[PDB]
Amino acid sequence: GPGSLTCVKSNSIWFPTSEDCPDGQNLCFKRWQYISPRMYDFTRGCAATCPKAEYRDVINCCGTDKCNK
Amino acid sequence: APGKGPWQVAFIGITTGLLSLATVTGNLLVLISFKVNTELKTVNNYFLLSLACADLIIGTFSMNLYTTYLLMGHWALGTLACDLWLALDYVASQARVMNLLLISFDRYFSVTRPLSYRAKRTPRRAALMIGLAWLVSFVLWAPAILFWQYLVGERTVLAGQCYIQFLSQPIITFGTAMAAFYLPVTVMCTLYWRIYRETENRNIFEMLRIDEGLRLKIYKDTEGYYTIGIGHLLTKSPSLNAAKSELDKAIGRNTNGVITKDEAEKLFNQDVDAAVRGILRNAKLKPVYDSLDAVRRAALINMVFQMGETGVAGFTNSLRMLQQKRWDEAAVNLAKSRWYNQTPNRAKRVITTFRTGTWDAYFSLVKEKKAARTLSAILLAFILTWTPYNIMVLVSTFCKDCVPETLWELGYWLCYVNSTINPMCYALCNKAFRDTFRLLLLCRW
Ligand SMILES: CC(C)CCC[C@@H](C)[C@H]1CC[C@H]2[C@@H]3CC=C4C[C@@H](OC(=O)CCC(=O)O)CC[C@]4(C)[C@H]3CC[C@]12C
Ligand SMILES: CC(C)CCC[C@@H](C)[C@H]1CC[C@H]2[C@@H]3CC=C4C[C@@H](OC(=O)CCC(=O)O)CC[C@]4(C)[C@H]3CC[C@]12C
Ligand SMILES: CC(C)CCC[C@@H](C)[C@H]1CC[C@H]2[C@@H]3CC=C4C[C@@H](OC(=O)CCC(=O)O)CC[C@]4(C)[C@H]3CC[C@]12C
Ligand SMILES: CC(C)CCC[C@@H](C)[C@H]1CC[C@H]2[C@@H]3CC=C4C[C@@H](OC(=O)CCC(=O)O)CC[C@]4(C)[C@H]3CC[C@]12C
Numbered sequence: 001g002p003g004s005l006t007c008v009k010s011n012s013i014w015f016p017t018s019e020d021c022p023d024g025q026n027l028c029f030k031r032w033q034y035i036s037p038r039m040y041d042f043t044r045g046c047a048a049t050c051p052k053a054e055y056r057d058v059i060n061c062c063g064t065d066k067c068n069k
Numbered sequence: 070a071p072g073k074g075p076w077q078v079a080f081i082g083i084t085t086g087l088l089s090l091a092t093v094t095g096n097l098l099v100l101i102s103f104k105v106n107t108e109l110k111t112v113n114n115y116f117l118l119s120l121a122c123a124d125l126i127i128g129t130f131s132m133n134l135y136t137t138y139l140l141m142g143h144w145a146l147g148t149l150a151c152d153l154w155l156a157l158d159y160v161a162s163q164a165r166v167m168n169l170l171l172i173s174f175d176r177y178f179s180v181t182r183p184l185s186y187r188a189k190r191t192p193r194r195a196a197l198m199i200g201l202a203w204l205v206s207f208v209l210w211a212p213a214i215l216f217w218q219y220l221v222g223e224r225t226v227l228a229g230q231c232y233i234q235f236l237s238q239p240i241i242t243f244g245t246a247m248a249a250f251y252l253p254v255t256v257m258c259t260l261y262w263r264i265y266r267e268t269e270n271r272n273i274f275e276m277l278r279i280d281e282g283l284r285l286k287i288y289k290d291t292e293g294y295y296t297i298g299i300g301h302l303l304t305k306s307p308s309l310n311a312a313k314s315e316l317d318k319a320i321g322r323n324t325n326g327v328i329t330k331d332e333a334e335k336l337f338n339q340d341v342d343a344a345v346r347g348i349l350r351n352a353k354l355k356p357v358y359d360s361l362d363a364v365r366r367a368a369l370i371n372m373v374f375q376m377g378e379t380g381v382a383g384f385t386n387s388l389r390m391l392q393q394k395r396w397d398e399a400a401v402n403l404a405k406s407r408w409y410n411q412t413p414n415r416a417k418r419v420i421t422t423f424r425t426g427t428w429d430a431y432f433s434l435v436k437e438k439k440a441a442r443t444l445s446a447i448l449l450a451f452i453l454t455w456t457p458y459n460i461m462v463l464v465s466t467f468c469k470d471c472v473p474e475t476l477w478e479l480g481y482w483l484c485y486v487n488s489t490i491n492p493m494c495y496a497l498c499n500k501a502f503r504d505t506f507r508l509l510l511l512c513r514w
């Protein structure tokens with residue numbers, strides 16, 4: 001949004017919440033982190049830069065209100 | 070970019086179709102041989118039938134779809150096929166461990182409650198046990214794997230992948246390993262440990278059962294004294310009214326002269342623990358009991374059960390020979406005893422028990438060692454194919470990344486190999502499956 005930016009917030013397997021981005025973080029990320037073959041740790045939130053995508057990671061970035069749903 | 074795969078996936082990919090066929094055919098044999106042969110219909114094998122049903126689902130659906138997913142690197146069968154594959158795999162795997170619990174407890178209650186538990190050990194109640202085990206396995210995993218995405222309102226599983234959505238957190242996979250594997254394995258190991266020590270007591274029960282008799286109602290013994298159960302003297306008073314009151318003292322219930330099957334076992338355990346405790350407090354019987362093996366300690370417990378601690382301690386030469394491991398020479402001395410001349414055949418059975426070191430004078434124990442070996446095989450085959458993956462998920466939770474990807478695929482795969490070798494254990498352990506499989510494969514039914 002213009003000035004303000006709210007991302008979906010998720011660090012667990014339960015219902016997601018919403019986070020108001022602090023100044024300097026203008027992106028919403030949706031991040032699947034690889035640990036073991038069928039294991040992907042799923043996180044959603046706000047960030048200043050997109051996290052580094054390692055081997056077998058899938059990361060989606062965007063700058064719209066709640067675009068990482 | 071070309072992908073250079075490891076030799077492990079080549080190993081998994083080629084042999085999976087071959088092991089899938091071996092799993093389904095071997096598990097169809099136990100299924101059909103159970104229907105063709107009415108003699109295989111023993112309560113022990115009914116549990117094995119439920120394991121084979123779980124092994125059949127793994128060999129038909131779980132094993133093949135795993136290897137397609139492994140070899141393609143993604144799930145191309147849609148979102149619904151993923152949920153069904155995960156459900157069928159986890160429910161069947163949970164039914165396996167739930168069954169292995171039932172088999173373990175069944176041996177435990179059969180040995181610790183020989184008269185009580187086997188009294189109600191019918192092919193009908195074992196069906197309820199198998200039915201409930203498959204029911205709880207379904208209710209735990211099936212509605213959760215299929216409908217968790219509908220509960221949280223979103224499907225967060227990666228689009229090209231296939232896994233349980235509510236285990237998509239590393240700490241949760243640790244807890245599931247502890248609760249679904251490590252907790253059931255520890256209780257099975259403790260049950261397996263207790264069975265080893267309790268079967269000695271089970272044999273003493275059957276030993277004394279034929280020597281001392283078994284009656285649930287008060288009766289006069291060979292000396293005219295009122296007795297109930299396995300040689301439990303109630304009173305030496307001529308009035309049976311004292312016998313009823315003494316029975317009401319040991320059993321906190323208005324017995325009116327009769328006890329139940331459970332109550333008989335409790336009196337036997339109290340009397341045999343008092344017998345072995347009388348052995349331990351005696352300085353003459355302390356060394357000989359410790360030195361002897363399980364079968365000969367049972368014969369010593371028999372004599373103490375019959376006469377008493379101070380009665381058996383008088384046989385100084387015989388005890389001095391049993392501690393000295395001179396069995397044939399000690400057998401002729403106890404024949405010289407007044408004990409030998411008074412009881413007709415109990416003494417001779419106890420004598421042959423010392424010199425032979427076997428139970429041959431009482432029973433054979435060839436059928437029960439066979440079933441115990443069948444138990445030991447299915448548990449050990451479960452441990453050797455499931456702990457690798459589970460010690461990996463353990464170290465994966467603490468160590469960041471030090472278990473290779475090739476080992477995960479092997480360990481995950483090795484759990485499937487358990488389903489392939491259960492029929493092999495059956496034909497190797499039970500010689501009735503072995504022969505019934507031969508007439509089915511050669512078309513001789
Ligand atoms: C009659 C058939 C159905 C039974 C045998 C089937 C499999 C058990 C065999 C067939 C081809 C064999 C494979 C042939 C070649 C190799 C490569 C070999 O690679 C190495 O030795 C070093 C590898 C490296 O350094 O990268 C490891 C064993 C393996 C996978 C073999 C494993 C066992 C396989 C899959
Ligand atoms: C379709 C997928 C999702 C699951 C397939 C599971 C089958 C392998 C299970 C489900 C119902 C089971 C059957 C349900 C009840 C019986 C009766 C039972 O009959 C007896 O043992 C009594 C003696 C006799 O009739 O011969 C034999 C096993 C059998 C056929 C079971 C065999 C294995 C079955 C077919
Ligand atoms: C398809 C998946 C999800 C469930 C598979 C369930 C089977 C593994 C369970 C459910 C019904 C159970 C059967 C239901 C009834 C019987 C008959 C029962 O036979 C007797 O009671 C002996 C006396 C008589 O034959 O009447 C022995 C257990 C058995 C085979 C049970 C064995 C295990 C079965 C097949
Ligand atoms: C179904 C039964 C009757 C026959 C199939 C037996 C297999 C399940 C056994 C037999 C040979 C075993 C394998 C022999 C050698 C190894 C190498 C061993 O070490 C390595 O893989 C090297 C480290 C690495 O490169 O990752 C890991 C286990 C494994 C695959 C063993 C896993 C279990 C195997 C495949």
Ligand SMILES: CN1[C@@H]2CC[C@H]1C[C@H](OC(=O)[C@H](CO)c1ccccc1)C2
Pocket residue numbers: 158159162163166245246247249250455458459462481484485
């Ligand atoms: C889907 N898993 C099951 C069958 C193949 C994989 C590997 C095994 O995973 C487990 O051992 C875990 C516990 O660590 C488990 C999950 C559900 C039931 C029993 C065991 C069972």
